[PDB]
């Protein structure tokens, strides 16, 4: 991204008050400069010995304060929805960003790049409820045999427990707190920190680790002034 | 065409067909001057006295 060397914060705000956008856009970029940098570029233009000139390239947003959403999916036994990713509401329609790279999240505020996004009707939201939504052909992934897995979402996880496999969800304090019968269960990241699915262990919550410290002591500069005894000498 | 049109609005979302030229920034630097002070001993006045 655009380093704090290439563009200071004073100068970024200097450029933001000059962008042809609305007070509502100007205010969103001032409060997510981290993301705006990760989305900006810096291209070296004219390099002379005694003066360097580069071109910064900031992002401009088309729409703001749209309601967005993100889709994770898991096998159903066997179905597996394959329209996974970020959905946002464009004007009238819905823009759909399928690669997890092009969309940045901070707090509760998503920033997506529209360069390769798909535009879908608002009726795809009806696919989550019924796979045979007659108002849209939900792209699905099928299979003639039992499958089992988990998929860790933003705020929890999904456990596809099917067949003779043995899946469970542990809690850090209480250990195993639920066994899973054959079905699609959803587990909250509040109660559960681990979900075992067979022989593979999924981690629903990040695991806190050792805290490291590197101590530094102030360095003392010392010198020794060289003083001559003139008074005893100016007497002799 | 990106010749005639620089913007296209579609509803409530604004697309930018052409890049928006911006403010030009400059960071000026002035030459740094090294200075020292040569130490000359009055030997001629000393070699006479």
């Amino acid at each position, epitope marked *: 991204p655009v380093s704090t060397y290439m563009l200071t914060n*004073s100068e970024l*705000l*200097s450029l*933001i*008050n*000059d962008m*042809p*956008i*609305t*007070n*509502d856009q*100007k*205010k969103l*970029m*001032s409060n997510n400069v981290q993301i705006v940098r990760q989305q900006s570029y810096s291209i070296m233009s004219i390099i002379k010995e005694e003066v360097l000139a580069y071109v910064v390239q900031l992002p401009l947003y088309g729409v703001i304060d749209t309601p967005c959403w993100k889709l994770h999916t898991s096998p159903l036994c066997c179905l597996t929805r394959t329209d996974r990713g970020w959905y946002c509401d464009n004007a009238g329609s819905v823009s759909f960003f399928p690669q997890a790279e092009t969309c940045k999240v901070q707090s509760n505020r998503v920033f997506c790049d529209t360069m390769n996004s798909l535009t879908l009707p608002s009726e795809v939201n009806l696919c989550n409820v019924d796979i045979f939504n007659p108002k849209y052909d939900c792209k699905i992934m099928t299979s003639k045999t039992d499958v089992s897995s988990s998929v860790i979402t933003s705020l929890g996880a999904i456990v596809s427990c099917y067949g003779k496999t043995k899946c469970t969800a542990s809690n850090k304090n209480r250990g195993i707190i639920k066994t899973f019968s054959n079905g699609c269960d959803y587990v909250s990241n509040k109660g559960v920190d681990t979900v075992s699915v067979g022989n593979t262990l999924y981690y629903v919550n990040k695991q806190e680790g050792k805290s490291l410290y590197v101590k530094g002591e102030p360095i003392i500069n010392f010198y020794d002034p060289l003083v001559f005894p003139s008074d005893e000498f100016d007497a002799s | 065409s990106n010749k005639g049109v620089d913007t296209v609005s579609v509803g409530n979302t604004l697309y930018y067909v052409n890049k928006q030229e*911006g*403010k*030009s920034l400059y960071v000026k630097g002035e030459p740094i001057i090294n200075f020292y002070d040569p130490l000359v001993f009055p030997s001629d006045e000393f070699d006479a006295s």
Partner: antibody
Amino acid sequence: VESGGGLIQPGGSLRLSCAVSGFTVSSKYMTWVRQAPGKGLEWVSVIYGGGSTYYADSVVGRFTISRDNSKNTLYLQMNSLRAEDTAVYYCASRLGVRATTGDLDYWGQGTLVTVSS
Amino acid sequence: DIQMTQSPSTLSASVGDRVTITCRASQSISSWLAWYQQKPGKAPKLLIYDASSLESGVPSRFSGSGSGTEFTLTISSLQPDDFATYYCQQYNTYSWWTFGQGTKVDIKR
């Protein structure tokens, strides 16, 4: 602080000049507000740090906002003045620093422009 | 474009009173409403910006509140300092700034 206002016959031209001291004009957006006799405040024209200029509907095409880095003074060329343009023209900018756009806390003295035969 | 409308036309109040001027927006302007003081024959004086942040160095007796379409300017303890005309300003975008029509204030004494 302004100058260059005054009376000019309808259809004539007039040149305002906004003397600004304390800060550089080439790093902040500058604005023009006019005020009719006994009416409210009406925004007129604005120039941002990067040269973008915008004029309200009432005056667009007939006015021309510009600045010169040398004399550190933003102007406001007013061509084809009619009776309704007669008002007192204030210039303003924002001394302090933030990233929102619109408030003002330096305003000039205020110069009268009268259009009459 | 947006238009701002205040009430009333002229508001009378004595020294030390609590005065409340309102300013309404034809569109939700988020949090960008500025208040201005104009003593007759003078330049506008900035009291409040961004709905709620008070400009540093202006008496703390002035206060603002609200966001969206319903905004209010409230003075806690009135002074002879303040008797003048008050203006509200929307700045929801770059291109189009529009002012209030003004609330002119007199006294009882």
